[PDB]
Amino acid sequence: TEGLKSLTELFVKENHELRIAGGAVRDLLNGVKPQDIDFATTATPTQMKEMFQSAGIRMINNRGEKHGTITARLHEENFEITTLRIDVEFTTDWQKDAERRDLTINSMFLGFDGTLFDYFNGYEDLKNKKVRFVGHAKQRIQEDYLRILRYFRFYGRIVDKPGDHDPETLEAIAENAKGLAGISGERIWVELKKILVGNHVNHLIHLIYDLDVAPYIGLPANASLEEFDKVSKNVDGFSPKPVTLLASLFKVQDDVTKLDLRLKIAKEEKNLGLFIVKNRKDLIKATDSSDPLKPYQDFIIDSREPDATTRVCELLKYQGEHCLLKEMQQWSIPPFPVSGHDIRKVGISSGKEIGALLQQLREQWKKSGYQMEKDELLSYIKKT
Amino acid sequence: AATREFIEMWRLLGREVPEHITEEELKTLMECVSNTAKKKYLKYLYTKEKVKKARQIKKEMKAAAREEAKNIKLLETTEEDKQKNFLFLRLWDRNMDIAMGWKGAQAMQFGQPLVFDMAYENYMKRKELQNTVSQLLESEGWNRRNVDPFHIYFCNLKIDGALHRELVKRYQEKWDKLLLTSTEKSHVDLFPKDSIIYLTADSPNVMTTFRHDKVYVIGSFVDKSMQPGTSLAKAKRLNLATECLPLDKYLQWEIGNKNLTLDQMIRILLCLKNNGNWQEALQFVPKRKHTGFLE
Amino acid sequence: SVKGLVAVITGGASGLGLATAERLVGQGASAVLLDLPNSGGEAQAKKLGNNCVFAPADVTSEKDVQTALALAKGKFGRVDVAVNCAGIAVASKTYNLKKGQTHTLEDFQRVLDVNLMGTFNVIRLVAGEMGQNEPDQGGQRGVIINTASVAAFEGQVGQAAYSASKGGIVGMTLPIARDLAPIGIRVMTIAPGLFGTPLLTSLPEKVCNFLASQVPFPSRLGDPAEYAHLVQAIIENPFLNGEVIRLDGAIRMQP
Amino acid sequence: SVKGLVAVITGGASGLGLATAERLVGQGASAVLLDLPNSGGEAQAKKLGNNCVFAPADVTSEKDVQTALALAKGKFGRVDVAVNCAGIAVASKTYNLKKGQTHTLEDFQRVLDVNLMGTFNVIRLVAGEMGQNEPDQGGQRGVIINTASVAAFEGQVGQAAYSASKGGIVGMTLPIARDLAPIGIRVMTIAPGLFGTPLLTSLPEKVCNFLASQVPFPSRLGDPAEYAHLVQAIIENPFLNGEVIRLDGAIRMQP
Amino acid sequence: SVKGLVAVITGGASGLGLATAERLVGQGASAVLLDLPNSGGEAQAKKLGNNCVFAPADVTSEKDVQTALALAKGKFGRVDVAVNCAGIAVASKTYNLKKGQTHTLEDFQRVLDVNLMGTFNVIRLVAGEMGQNEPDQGGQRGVIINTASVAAFEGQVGQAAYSASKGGIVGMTLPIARDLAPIGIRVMTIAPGLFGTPLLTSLPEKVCNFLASQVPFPSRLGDPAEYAHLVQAIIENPFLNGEVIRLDGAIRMQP
Amino acid sequence: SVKGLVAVITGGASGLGLATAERLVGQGASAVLLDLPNSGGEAQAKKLGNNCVFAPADVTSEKDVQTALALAKGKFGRVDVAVNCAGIAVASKTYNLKKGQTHTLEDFQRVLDVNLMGTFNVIRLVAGEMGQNEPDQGGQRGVIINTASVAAFEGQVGQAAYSASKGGIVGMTLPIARDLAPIGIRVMTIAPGLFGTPLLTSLPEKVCNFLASQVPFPSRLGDPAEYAHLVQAIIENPFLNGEVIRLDGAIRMQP
RNA sequence: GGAAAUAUGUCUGAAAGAGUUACUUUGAUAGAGUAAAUAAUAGGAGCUUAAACCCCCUUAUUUCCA
Ligand SMILES: NC(=O)c1ccc[n+]([C@@H]2O[C@H](COP(=O)([O-])OP(=O)(O)OC[C@H]3O[C@@H](n4cnc5c(N)ncnc54)[C@H](O)[C@@H]3O)[C@@H](O)[C@H]2O)c1
Ligand SMILES: NC(=O)c1ccc[n+]([C@@H]2O[C@H](COP(=O)([O-])OP(=O)(O)OC[C@H]3O[C@@H](n4cnc5c(N)ncnc54)[C@H](O)[C@@H]3O)[C@@H](O)[C@H]2O)c1
Ligand SMILES: NC(=O)c1ccc[n+]([C@@H]2O[C@H](COP(=O)([O-])OP(=O)(O)OC[C@H]3O[C@@H](n4cnc5c(N)ncnc54)[C@H](O)[C@@H]3O)[C@@H](O)[C@H]2O)c1
Ligand SMILES: NC(=O)c1ccc[n+]([C@@H]2O[C@H](COP(=O)([O-])OP(=O)(O)OC[C@H]3O[C@@H](n4cnc5c(N)ncnc54)[C@H](O)[C@@H]3O)[C@@H](O)[C@H]2O)c1
Ligand SMILES: Nc1ncnc2c1ncn2[C@@H]1O[C@H](CSCC[C@H](N)C(=O)O)[C@@H](O)[C@H]1O
Ligand SMILES: Nc1ccn([C@@H]2O[C@H](COP(=O)(O)OP(=O)(O)O)[C@@H](O)[C@H]2O)c(=O)n1
């Protein structure tokens, strides 16, 4: 690409070797243009500063310079480059940096000419869809625990079938599960989301529960897997949200609250889990009612913001009512016509009475199927 | 006229529930292009008129109470009120005002200067301007009623500026009789650059002990839309030493807005000047901002 | 010291007179509270002890003062010191134009009678009583002290009658001091300023705070014990005579 | 000049009051001799011409002073100046050990009534009368002057009652000056020394001659014309107020 | 009238002295201005007319005052009146604990020298010239008038040196009056309060306005013409002597 | 009581200062005599005891007073009282026509420097050390007494300079009392009359006996112990301030 | 970086209290009387109004990111 050529020119000017690294290299080897592009450079951060100053390309320090990570905007395109390093010690050698890598699937570094330089047979691992750790897998696990989750995500994303797990890897993960508790909860939450939105999610979740990672991560020891399995099947191909599946696994709202407090995830997901747990037990479609979607429509009308509309849509996804979910998508919350002024014209001044009458008219409007008109409501309004 | 019809439409829509029509506020509506912003103006305008109605009701109630008190006195008819044994006439308000005036004159002759620089007009809106004027009035009152009043200077005050006009309107004829020095010239001209200390909440220097041989300059500024560094910027431009109160040192400030109102600042400074310790001086900080005194 | 003396304190049942009586009795002297029968001086006289005795009399009444002084002589046998701390205060503007109100003459007359005429009557009668005594080593037969006011020097608005009475006391101080010089009696005046007493303490809290703030130093209403101590000092010193001491605290009354 | 001013002079039938009336009438003013009925003031008022009108009154009596002020208002239509020159003197020691004689209370009371109470009564009633005057250019509605001997400051033996009354006048001069300030009336006090007048002449002539010789300079008894001139100066000066001026001749009354 | 009098006025090139010279010269008298050579009083002397002559001199300098008096004698051959209206004012607290500032001794010494020592030097020197005069029929050879301040009685804060000087003038008023009484020279003191003059220029305008508002009546700064009129009245009256006249407008200075 | 107080007495070598020092030291206080080196005050300091020390100084000179105050602070650490009794008297007539002799300005200047300038210098210099003291109960840091004279009020012939100095002291009394009131220092003044001291003994014996007979009562010359007692009374009393006290004995100076 | 928190310009606080300024020479409750300022609570938006709330954007502080 043009940006790639500009980056090659800039780094040749710097004279320090550069190679795409990681997911970008994996995607290129897959034959798909990489969605994310990551570069590794032999240059030290001081050399990066010098060459950027001598180049004039606008600079971005995203706080990653602790590991040599910097961004430069060439032709309005941001290129992210990290200094090659070993486990922060910078290394110009590509083999040593690849050894520092976690998984072979990302160890290889591609030359800008299009030629790969793999030092641990990672490319063949990708071609075979197998997963191989850089050097000693157990040592890599010892290095970092969150990596367990990285390996799980890579397996779900890459491996074509479930159950293709290395027993050595599984036992090492089970042994090292103790360390996973210490790692920061954000990264845990991000990796969990990524795994959930991935393939083999049911099998991966079952394996994780078998590994007993939940106590270290704070997930409940016992979960309604069967319910989770049904929910996954229903939402399979329906863009499920990870919190939806987690709630399906969850049984009580307050456990989800504690899990959020541990992870410190956005309050939006907190509400997600809360009302999901509440409604899956409480709110259900009314087949006896002409419209089984009518209870959900009324509940949405009761709520304030369209966020509740999306929330009920996610609840429908959880329940698997694909037809009802579609109808909700096409269905739009009709506006309640009567305003407080109509009531004031009718001859009501007490504000609290106005609100009570508005609520009553809302229930009557819902009962009428929303077909009742504003003047019909006014006739319904009892002068007082 | 069109404003009148719009106000009637508001009454029908009952937002701000306008009740009475006035020429000045009507022409303000005509001038106030933004009706979205005007919603709050009309809301607190109607609140003002209600408050006037409630004031009339309360005045009726208080007149009834005064009639009750006077007829109670009439029925009691005790007579021999202290056997008519008084030593002074009941003219205490006048005597208090006169004593305050004498103290103010003495201070103006031999008082420690304290400067308010009204050079922030360009950084304030109408509401902020009114708040600044009210705070200045309160601060001047607190200084006046003290036992060791400051000699208050009003520097950078434009003769016809917005602040000057508002202050004159608020003080009526008292403005000319006030015992404070109001001058066009900036504080730098009046005093040597050495003695001036420009108080501000941004300066790295931390005020430790009140110094009686220094002129403390307080920025007569109200900053609703946070603009950090304005006072510090001015002090650096004039090359004037700056200080900040030790709010963290003696209070568990934690997360809060370090800015303090002018009246709180002057009360703290007066307490410090009167040999009060830092706890007594800082008591005047709003209680909400700080949890409690440190140790 | 003042032990063994006999003091006749007019208006001694309250305020400055009571403080002076308390101090003198504590020092061992004997006192006679010459205050109105309904003031409540009998309780104070009983409280002080056998030394203090209450004699109900009205200073404006010649017969009553004669009776009180005779009682004092009978119960103690001599009169060495006299204190005139009895008086009243009336506040009223001389003439108010807006209200069309004029100062009443009865108020002026009664204030004069109680303060100035009363003080002079007590002075003459007790001067006779003292002159009946025997001279001391220095010839001082006795001491007479009169309580004037700072209002006698700078009155406030509405203090016409009070100022007139206290100024009369101030003016007659020296002439009387010269009248009794052959006898050997020393006449002195004390002009207290603002003192915490029933006259002032009865005012609102804010008024008392303001008045206390007025005094340059100390910024507190003068304690009556200070007045009693000054009276004791005047008694002890055999040279003070015909002088007005301003026990004011440096306060000059405001306009 | 003082042309057109209307003056009410108490005790204007003799001595300093008569001298002031003479001077003010000669200057073109209009006087009202306010004196006792059997005082001979009628002859003087007739002598001085149309500008004088004798007003028989007693200062100690409220009704008489009110009647006199009504007469003055009817005759001249306004009152602009007041001069309290009416008073008496008494010579009696406070106590005389050799003679066993005590000052009578009646003499003291009468002297206070005439000198002090009468002066205050006239002052208040005249202030009420002058309140109706339209303010002049400077806002001065009127002027009040009071005579109060130097005995108020340095009295002599047997001068207790006089000194008391004159000290009362001196003390009340200021608070009244403050009371009437909003109205716009200037109150002043002249403290004469020794003068040639019937009051002094009542005493032995040899002692009067000695006292006249005792004045440092001039060594003669003050002429009442000097007092009248000083009164005119006080009236003219629009800034004198609330002060006691000693028209004494530098004499300090010896013991 | 004062036609033919010769007056030596110190500090007569500005303020009160200038007004006094104006009034006396307009009345018909002749005046000699005795002010500092740089005071620019020559223009004032030219403006007043031929009856006024400016004689440069410093009151503190004995030789300069002698030269000025000799010039006055040479021009007019007589000195009947002396007026001391030359002085300076210094505002400085005795000790300011907060600032750690102590009243300088040089300021106090200068203030005393200019006011008190200057006035006494002028008095003693002009005494000889006035004594040279043939005594008038009444007896007085001449009149000496001094200027003082109400600060001599109650000086506000930061007025120690000025109050000291004026209190010295007040104290020595009477001794000099007695000293010169045998030779027929009258000494009088005027104690003005506030008067619009260059002396008040030191104070801020707002302070001056407040003080003016605080005058009981008239509520304004006294005009110099009023002081000149009072001086003329003092000169005319042959009995005023050895007295301090508070031409203050009834204002009493609070702390 | 006065136990533990430190008093700096100026001119304590002899006269009133010596009597005050003797009384205060006998009461258990500590004194610092501050008189000229040739006054022989070191012998008196030795006689008084260990509590008293002699600091040779000239009150006119700032450096001398500073050295004396530093010595007092070093010896004791506090200055809780400052008595100003140093002073000199000169009897010289302002002008003597008969002998054609004029008061020399040098004598007047010297007298002012020694009395008035000296007292103010002592006040301003000792105010700092009094301020150093932390406030006690009631917020008092020190007490400054100044010895004026009755000549400030009624001076005699040939007493112009002395009267001027004492009148200046009296005039500056109150302004200093207001200046130091915030600091918490009470300023008082005592105006003794005729006191038997080395100053008087130089005068003729006939004059001394006539003066002793001239006092109304006691008909004698005041023993300095009476001053000392009055000074102690002023010290003890916490409310006396900004006042002049006449310890004269009802004597008014002869014309 | 994305989250997650708060923000009351006199103080408490949700409307009301304590506050503030200008005048009345106050007759003993002036402990009052005429007036002034008083903005649903950081600054601007939707939703509305009885109070409102609820959310969008902007700004000031804070704890967490191979
Ligand atoms: N209180 C002050 O601040 C103050 C200030 C200056 C002067 N004074 C004067 O000091 C004196 C002390 O009085 P006080 O302040 O203690 O007030 P007070 O009322 O407590 O004392 C006055 C006393 O005089 C008595 N009395 C009144 N009229 C009497 C009469 N006709 N015959 C006999 N006894 C009579 C009263 O019963 C009372 O005991 C008074 O004359 C007062 O005017 C007081
Ligand atoms: N004579 C002096 O040297 C001298 C000195 C100082 C003060 N004074 C005062 O000066 C004033 C003038 O006295 P004088 O020297 O002219 O003597 P005077 O006797 O001639 O004056 C007194 C006048 O007052 C009048 N009078 C007295 N009582 C009166 C009353 N009750 N009502 C009305 N009129 C009354 C008398 O009739 C007489 O006309 C007196 O008040 C006196 O005390 C006089
Ligand atoms: N200004 C007031 O209101 C006021 C009040 C009370 C007393 N006084 C006294 O009145 C007097 C007049 O002052 P003023 O108000 O006219 O102010 P002023 O400054 O106009 O008068 C002072 C005059 O004294 C002259 N002068 C100063 N030092 C002199 C010297 N050493 N030798 C000769 N002439 C000298 C000046 O040149 C000037 O003409 C002063 O003594 C002042 O203290 C003034
Ligand atoms: N003696 C009286 O009857 C009488 C009366 C009224 C006032 N006074 C005043 O009272 C004070 C006491 O004086 P006294 O009667 O004891 O006479 P005194 O001479 O005995 O005392 C005066 C003292 O002042 C000292 N002194 C003078 N100049 C001094 C200087 N420059 N520095 C230091 N010390 C200095 C002298 O050495 C002496 O000790 C004097 O100020 C006197 O003027 C005295
Ligand atoms: N914590 C603090 N330290 C010092 N001065 C402060 C302060 N809080 C308020 N002030 C003073 O009070 C004034 C009004 S506060 C306005 C602050 C505004 N940001 C500015 O630029 O100043 C400030 O200008 C400052 O003078
Ligand atoms: N816990 C971790 C986190 C990151 N890493 C490595 O650090 C690299 C930094 O993340 P990145 O997003 O830049 O990686 P790529 O996009 O270049 O693959 C990852 O690719 C991992 O190989 C690790 O090994 N262990």
Author numbering:
A (entry chain E): 42 to 128, 138 to 434
B (entry chain F): 92 to 386
C (entry chain C), D (entry chain D), E (entry chain A), F (entry chain B): 7 to 261
Published text:
We determined the structures of these four mt-tRNA maturation complexes using single-particle cryo-EM at a global resolution ranging from 2.7 to 3.2 Å, revealing snapshots of the four tRNA maturation steps, i.e. N1-methylation of purine 9, 5′-leader and 3′-trailer processing and 3′-CCA addition. The architecture of the maturation complexes is globally the same in all structures, i.e. TRMT10C asymmetrically straddles a tetramer of SDR5C1, while wrapping around the pre-tRNA. Our structures show that the TRMT10C/SDR5C1 complex can be a scaffold that presents mitochondrial pre-tRNAs as substrates for chemical modification, i.e. methylation, and nucleolytic cleavages at defined 5′ and 3′ sites and, finally 3′-CCA addition.
The head domain (residues 1-178) harbours conserved catalytic carboxylate residues, i.e. D77, D79 and E121 that coordinate two Mg2+ ions in enzymes of the class-II nucleotidyltransferase family. Base-specific interactions can occur between the CDP and conserved residues D194 and R197, further stabilised by interactions with L196 and E193, as observed for the B. stearothermophilus CCA-adding enzyme. D194 and R197 can also specifically accommodate an ATP molecule in the active site of TRNT1. The tail domain of TRNT1 forms a shape-and-charge complementary surface that accommodates the T-loop of mt-tRNAIle, which could be entirely built in this complex.
